[PDB]
Design a protein around this ligand. Structure first.
Ligand code: HEM
Ligand code: CL
Length: 153
């Protein structure tokens, strides 16, 4: 369970993300695909992209990044009260997309890397600690939902 103080560090850096969601979504998805190329294979819509340049030029990938970060933003703004938001996300990711928890760990790493790179004014050690705790909470609750849904994750 995060403290209010931890949530405020989380929401303070997220406020900067929100200056340019699309840009942050591109950086995060590209970082994920570069660091863990197996994750790209889960995306039938994107798995043809061969290079970072093709990824940067992909209008569709940018749209998807906005969709992803906006969903995560809405979860973070619930400050742990995210049962309603997690139900559809867990169901699609377990049953349609088949995304293991390991891959959620990978995108968590990508989010942290990008925030660390772009936002050193709002992402020092304590802020990164808080964001890690929020993402761990997200993954813990998603894992529990996966198990309820019948997906071992
Ligand atoms: C913070 C973690 C994540 C969030 C908030 C997130 C959010 C979303 C959202 C909102 C959608 C659109 C609606 C839906 O199908 O549920 C989506 C689609 C999808 N997600 Fe995620 N996602 C996350 C992590 C991942 C990861 C790590 C992968 C793969 C390694 C993944 C693979 C997909 C795929 C394949 C789709 C369908 C894309 C398409 O063809 O339209 N997700 N995700
Ligand atoms: Cl800090």
């Amino acid at each position: 369970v995060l403290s209010e103080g931890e949530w405020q560090l989380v929401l303070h850096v997220w406020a900067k993300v929100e200056a340019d969601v699309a840009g942050h979504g591109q950086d995060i998805l590209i970082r994920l695909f570069k660091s863990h190329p197996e994750t790209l294979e889960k995306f039938d819509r994107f798995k043809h992209l061969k290079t970072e340049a093709e990824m940067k030029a992909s209008e569709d990938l940018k749209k998807h990044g906005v969709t992803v970060l906006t969903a995560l933003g809405a979860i973070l703004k619930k400050k742990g009260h995210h049962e309603a938001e997690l139900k559809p996300l867990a169901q699609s990711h377990a049953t349609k997309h088949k995304i293991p928890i390991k891959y959620l760990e990978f995108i968590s790493e990508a989010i942290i890397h990008v925030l660390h790179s772009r936002h050193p004014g709002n992402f020092g050690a304590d802020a990164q600690g808080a964001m890690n705790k929020a993402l761990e909470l997200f993954r813990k609750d998603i894992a529990a939902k996966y198990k309820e849904l019948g997906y071992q994750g």
